[PDB]
Symmetry: C2
Subunit: 238 residues, 2 copies
């Protein structure tokens, strides 16, 4: 199933995400959630750290993992974990073991392997692949998602993680592979702002086969693939 | 906000709707639902009458109304209520008082007025207009919804209901007006099958002001407007 949601504002998108985080936490069983970094996740973290979310969300039932992470120390300005910690985790009461950071300070190939083994060990699996309850994703102006970049992504990668490099900066990242995104119950591309209007129009109107964009090609095989836009991102299609 | 959902099968569409019907019923308070007739509602009624829905849905909390009704006796083949009753109501335990049919056997104008007063009396209002929790809508091959037909719909009608005549047969209907649809918390256009692919593509790609279709023009003002499609109806856009 595919679900496209167009909200009037970025704030409305983030509220809807926060409401879902709360609902997940009330279910009772562990919920494994994969986090992206960037401007929309930043907004989400700030709302989640505020009342009444900070108090009402049952953080003990939620597990945070990362769809990708920059290979820098967790206190570096470019750490996804570091930003989530600064805006959210340091402001709430959540079991430390429910936060599953990628070790960006470590040798990346061995870290990708440790990260993959942790996912497979902790998260319920289907055919050996961890099944996320929810993966939050970005879409770059180049169509990338997590750190799966156009022209670098092996869609038949059987591993659960990969070391990839940013195509412009050469920065190393540890990323989930497409396989893990495809295995998830629900993945949600959070695509906000005028800056994304053009790529939205391309993905919306063009067969995925004709595009080089990982975000256009990767969907949950048997679950839900969602596109969250605000009116600015949707301005060319709605 | 606008929500588009594309499901792989008609069964999956109606499953999603029945799950929502269940959840609505579990809030220990009245939920006002407006029903359309036609193939998809038909499928929904059969599912609602099956296990586990027949027994688990708290029918005492749901109130059913009609977005439109054919001005025929309730046991006539052409009655929307009559079909809902044959497929669902006669198979479940639901208070008679919770089923608010349009009296299709009666003089249509005085019936439109009775229907209007009945909605205004018991459904919480906003600026005088009853606010439906959920309105299920069809979209005809001509773009009509409820019994609001292209070229014959007064989008500025301040009344809550209207007598309409089918443009082909002259058959009389009592319909909600556009105003009631626009005031609802949630309206959901249920558009299934290859027969709808062409008009799905037209509504999808053309500004509503350039289209004569009521279903292209009518949305919830401050709530959710949804389009539920199957792969077949989405074939020209996805």
């Amino acid at each position: 199933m595919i679900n496209h949601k167009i909200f009037p504002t970025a704030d409305a998108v983030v509220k809807s995400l926060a409401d879902d985080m709360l609902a997940y936490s009330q279910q009772g069983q562990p919920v494994h959630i994969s986090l992206s970094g960037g401007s929309t996740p930043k907004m989400l973290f700030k709302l989640l750290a505020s009342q009444p979310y900070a108090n009402d969300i049952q953080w003990k039932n939620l597990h945070f993992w990362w769809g990708d992470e920059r290979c820098v120390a967790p206190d570096d300005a470019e750490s996804n974990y570091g930003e989530a910690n600064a805006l959210l985790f340091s402001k709430i009461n959540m079991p430390a073991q429910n936060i599953h950071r990628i070790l960006g300070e470590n040798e990346p190939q061995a870290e990708a392997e440790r990260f993959a083994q942790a996912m497979a060990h902790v998260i319920p699996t289907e055919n050996g692949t961890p099944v996320f309850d929810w993966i939050l994703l970005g879409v770059g102006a180049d169509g990338h998602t997590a750190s799966l970049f156009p022209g670098q992504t092996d869609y038949a990668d059987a591993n659960l993680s990969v070391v990839a490099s940013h195509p412009e900066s050469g920065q190393l990242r540890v990323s989930k592979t497409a396989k893990v995104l495809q295995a998830a119950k629900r993945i949600s591309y959070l695509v906000l702002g005028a800056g994304k209007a053009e790529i939205v129009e391309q993905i919306h109107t063009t067969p995925a086969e004709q595009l080089p964009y990982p975000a256009a090609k990767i969907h949950s095989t048997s679950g839900v693939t969602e596109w969250y836009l605000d009116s600015d991102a949707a301005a060319k299609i709605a």
